[PDB]
Design a protein around this ligand. Sequence first.
Ligand SMILES: Nc1ncnc2c1ncn2[C@@H]1O[C@H](CSCC[C@H](N)C(=O)O)[C@@H](O)[C@H]1O
Ligand SMILES: Nc1ncnc2c1ncn2[C@@H]1O[C@H](CSCC[C@H](N)C(=O)O)[C@@H](O)[C@H]1O
Lengths: 159, 275, 273, 160
Amino acid sequence: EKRKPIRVLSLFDGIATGLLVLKDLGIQVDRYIASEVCEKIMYVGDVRSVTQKHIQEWGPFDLVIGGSPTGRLFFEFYRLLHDARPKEGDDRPFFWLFENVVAMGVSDKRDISRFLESNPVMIDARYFWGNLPGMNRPLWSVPVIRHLFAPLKEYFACV
Amino acid sequence: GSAEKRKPIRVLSLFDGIATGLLVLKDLGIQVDRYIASEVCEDSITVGMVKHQGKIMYVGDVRSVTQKHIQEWGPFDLVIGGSPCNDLSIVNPARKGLYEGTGRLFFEFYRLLHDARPKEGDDRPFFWLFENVVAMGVSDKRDISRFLESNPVMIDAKEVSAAHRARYFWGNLPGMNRPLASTVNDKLELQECLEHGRIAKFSKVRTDQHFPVFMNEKEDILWCTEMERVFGFPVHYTDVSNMSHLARQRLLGRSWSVPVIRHLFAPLKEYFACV
Amino acid sequence: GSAEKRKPIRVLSLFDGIATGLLVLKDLGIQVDRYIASEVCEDSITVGMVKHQGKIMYVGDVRSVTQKHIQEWGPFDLVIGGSPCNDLSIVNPARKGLYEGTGRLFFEFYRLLHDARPKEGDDRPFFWLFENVVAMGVSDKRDISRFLESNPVMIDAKEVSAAHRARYFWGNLPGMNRPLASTVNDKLELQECLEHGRIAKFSKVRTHFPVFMNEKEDILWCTEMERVFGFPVHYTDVSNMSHLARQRLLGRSWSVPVIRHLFAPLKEYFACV
Amino acid sequence: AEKRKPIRVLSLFDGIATGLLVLKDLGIQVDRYIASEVCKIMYVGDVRSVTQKHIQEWGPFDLVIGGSPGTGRLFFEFYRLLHDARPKEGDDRPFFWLFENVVAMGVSDKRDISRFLESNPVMIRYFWGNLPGMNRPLASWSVPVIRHLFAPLKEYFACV
Ligand SMILES: Nc1ncnc2c1ncn2[C@@H]1O[C@H](CSCC[C@H](N)C(=O)O)[C@@H](O)[C@H]1O
Ligand SMILES: Nc1ncnc2c1ncn2[C@@H]1O[C@H](CSCC[C@H](N)C(=O)O)[C@@H](O)[C@H]1O
């Protein structure tokens, strides 16, 4: 019931973008685990090696971020999301973000919006899906993720 | 470890095809509470609609099914599915893989399965089955096994039928890898599947330059009824809706082998009501 | 007026189609000694050869059967036939008539019948049946009746089935004009012939779109037409035939209950199971 | 097996009195000549009015002729008359027939007529018949032609 430092799971293409944005906002970090798709802050290698058991042991996680500024990188992210989400009945704050380029298949955008149950924020240009306050939508990339992540200051401890 | 009357089974069937799951469950004597099927091909929907007398509740495209739908229509005891394989098969040179094309339909399964399983603390029996081809990329198979947290069982219908048909089966059904029982009911040879006045060249048939049957003086391919027997279906199972022989052969070519599904489903008799 | 054991019936079927005659004879319990069929359509031959387990002896084009063949293959007790009608039907404006085109095929029947008739002094029972359409020219009907020395009986399958099909039957079968029995097997309504989840617009089909399904208009399915003409379901589900080929085979066929009505008095002449 | 008797003729020929003139040219006695067209020497009108019973009553017949110097109607009416007038099995009495048509006919028509009559035609016009001399192997108005064709009839029937 009190503000604690954030714990992060990153499938982002830039393994350190999330940590830099978080420290840029002054948010304390108790955990930051980075992974990549290829083909305690910690690098864990291929996402193909991260099992659900690893997600359990390293967790709990408060933030899950992924994407890159083809669709294989989304579903992997999706998997991690599913494995890191709080179970039903747990109301603790949990947030996620997924970025991709606007130049994508219209089918890809529709599929991602369906799977995430959310419509994207367009920023001229990139697409950003998330459940942060302000990313609710109808129907480098560092400072923009900073502004999008700003509401995390009202949920986790700041230094 | 508690006592209760065994209840009929509730099934969610994605990519249902010609309703092999319901046919097999009925043949095992398992009572079916409800059977919700997701399918888009109108020929397959007509087959399942006719041959099972409107028991199936069709819900259309698997991508039109939300988690809210799974909760409101559920609970489900059995979630089964065999997604399209044209973008997974190494035979296709234009295959887009598991993550693109029609391959990503697999994730819909992965999606709805997760929406359908019981919440933590619910010890109710819950079973699932996902089927696909053996001849896919090693990376595709590895990734499917990663997402399902299960390693597949390889079963070939040739052991229990007259068809060469090796498939991967992921799932938590009891005793999936157990040996298959060969009974008298199974037609192990192609000759047993042919119509009167036809001779089989080989023992088993493969799904060129081969017409598998001789009729009098000429060569010939299999008839629709003969493939129905080859795949284990009742004769004339696909004889609906004026569809061409090519349409029926296509429907049967994508389907599950009935005795294989029967082998996989049989242990469900110890969990649900039986007629 | 003499005594003898009833023997199985010997049949010559010209223009046999999908072997309706053998089906009807079996359904009546009449034992069939031999069934020789003349037919040229490979789809029809396949239907008859599969559905009757090689009992039929196919002899090909009716024009390749000589009188010596009738003697050597015979004797026959029953000679049946329904010759093609495309050149007799007034619906066809290119019709060549009874004496030209495929109309003259009738005379082949007329020929073989006369080759199969018992000789003078032979009182053995001998029956024959020739069938064709009602919608032919008056002169063609008069000439068929003159060559066969018989006047036709008009029977419409609509009395014992869900199909409008009025046909002329020449022959000497006992009591061909007697009233038809509407039994319990008879599906008099098109609705009784449809598959699950389809609704019939009309009581009897005349072959627009005769059925509704899920608020969508549709033509008859193959099994539904099989029921409409009185055949067993899936009787024509052989040989990878297109749906159009099945509809063609069924559209040329005899109505099964009508042939059953016509053949039934044969039970008092031949061995029955 | 008896002495020669005058000939009895059934004519469906196009040309009502051709056969009688040819028979008189050969000096053959005629006891009966029944003439008909498709449209004791009697004309009887339309062949549609001629029945098996009329054939039996006016008969017996020794010679049946038909044709013309579509072909289907003419030939099939002739074939009906030939069948009705033919001697029954066991009757070995002399019986002959002839059918003429123009050579300008459908090939299928020629094949069908040869099949029905069980004979191959004499080309000259086409002439089918069973007279001695009209026996032919498989292929690959003016009345003296019928005169020579009918010549063998004076060895089977009485001559004036
Ligand atoms: N988007 C979609 N939603 C639901 N079903 C789909 C679909 N896309 C394809 N399908 C169906 O998925 C099926 C995969 S083949 C599986 C057939 C089934 N196992 C049987 O035994 O009959 C095909 O029939 C195809 O029509
Ligand atoms: N020259 C020929 N010799 C034998 N059969 C022929 C023929 N020409 C056409 N036929 C056949 O004669 C049939 C006439 S329709 C009669 C069908 C049959 N009464 C039934 O109930 O099924 C057609 O099937 C056609 O294939």
